[PDB]
């Protein structure tokens, strides 16, 4: 549908908007290029591993490559919804969000290619709980926004995408991969990529918090919705963790399991009822 006019013709960008400021920070801090990462030592590391050691790394990598590909595709309805609401500064920021996710997809796929597993179908490490989140609930919640951009719908989309997928699973995923391979001295190229990815994702979670809080600020009752949507997805979060834990047991899992519980609970505390 038509444009009624243009904000930068009638006026200017809102230079003090929090998402304009986040956009500026993203440009300053968003220069890394996965194409520059040296994966040559990762290739040698992976080839020196035994077959059973090789397999141990793949379930987490399978979870991250799908996560990054999903969030690359599934942010587009949020950008559309906020554009249609006239939230220009949010849209400017989300162009950096979307491009970050493209680099994240690229990074993991370059690593798979370099270590010699690009031809392997890693889908076998997505259990039913993983699929419920990433194949189903995430795209459902985001695509809803094309026909329903109500505050309820936007809160639910930002909860599933930013607070659960990125703020709980991905955050715990980063941590876990460091807790394991930085200690072993393995995969320095991948760990550099993860460092850059984690820096990007700091910004992404701030957008999710801003979005949820500004809706909660209009009506305290949306706080209860936020908490409910978090709790709805917990069984699938922990059910995926239980599956990864069981795979690997076939590393302090009690410490990684608690990191996931910990992240879930601190995401809740970043939203204020008042």
């Amino acid at each position: 549908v038509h444009h009624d006019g243009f904000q930068t013709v009638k006026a200017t960008i809102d230079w003090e908007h929090p998402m304009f400021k986040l956009y500026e920070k993203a440009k300053r801090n968003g220069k890394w290029n996965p194409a520059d990462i040296d994966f040559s030592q990762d290739q040698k590391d992976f080839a020196s591993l035994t077959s059973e050691e090789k397999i141990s790394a793949l379930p987490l990598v399978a979870g991250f490559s799908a996560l990054e590909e999903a969030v690359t595709l599934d942010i587009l309805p949020m950008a559309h919804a906020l554009a249609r609401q006239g939230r220009l500064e949010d849209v400017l920021f989300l162009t950096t969000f979307m491009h970050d996710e493209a680099k994240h997809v690229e990074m993991f796929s370059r690593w798979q290619q370099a270590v010699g597993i690009g031809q392997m179908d890693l889908s076998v490490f997505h259990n039913d709980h993983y699929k419920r989140i990433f194949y189903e609930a995430l795209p459902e919640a985001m695509n809803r926004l094309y026909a329903d951009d109500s505050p309820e719908a936007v809160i639910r989309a930002a909860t599933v995408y930013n607070m659960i997928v990125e703020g709980t699973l991905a955050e715990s995923g980063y941590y876990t991969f460091r807790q394991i391979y930085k200690k072993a001295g393995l995969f320095p190229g991948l760990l550099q990529g993860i460092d850059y990815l984690n820096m990007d994702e700091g910004r992404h979670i701030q957008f999710g918090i801003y979005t949820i809080q500004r809706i909660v600020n209009e009506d305290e009752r949306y706080y209860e919705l936020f908490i409910r949507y978090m709790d709805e997805l917990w069984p699938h979060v922990i059910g995926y963790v239980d599956y990864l834990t069981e795979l690997g047991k076939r590393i302090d899992y009690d410490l990684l399991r608690h990191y996931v519980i910990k992240q879930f609970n601190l995401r809740k505390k970043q939203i204020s009822r008042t």
Copy 2:
């Protein structure tokens, strides 16, 4: 709707895809930041101008700020449509396209702010022909893609967006602004911005050509559609030029008018019937 699986889990990025290669080029060549441009001399230049000289610059700036804001918003349906078709490499490239347009919007709005016209409503310099293109036909053609991603619909969207708006009007707009203010020695910050913008837009037009040509390659009859959609918009293109020409006459317009005719015709020649 659901994800059936993920390309970078089942396999990898298609590293040889033309839009992956364009994506890589965009990252290498996409580092400029409008926030780094020094507009202090532009401010002094604009303030030294007489009121009548000041007004002469504003119709073109009004046309560009709306153009960049429109194309920032209106690329999102194309990204969605190609994502839904599984064209991952196109999507990766389009994250750089979208972010480029954000910077372009930002650049012109920073210039307006710096020279002291951000508070002026420049909408008065959008005539009926401008509105038909930018307020109406462009968003109509792109939004269509949410419900109709047929080859006809994709060709029409890429024709209006990439070949007319960017490849005919914007390209002629850049040229004109150089033909005028680089010669006068004025607005060095704005002209630096325009240089960077023109470099970005080289990539953007390659995406439009790739998209139209791959559809034409499936069925030669789509070539006739492409030419028809170009000719449909010509009256509004030239009608806007006639309006700008008349404003300014109230600089070789015969040379700028022919540049627009020239660009329109070479865009047609970048698409091959065969």
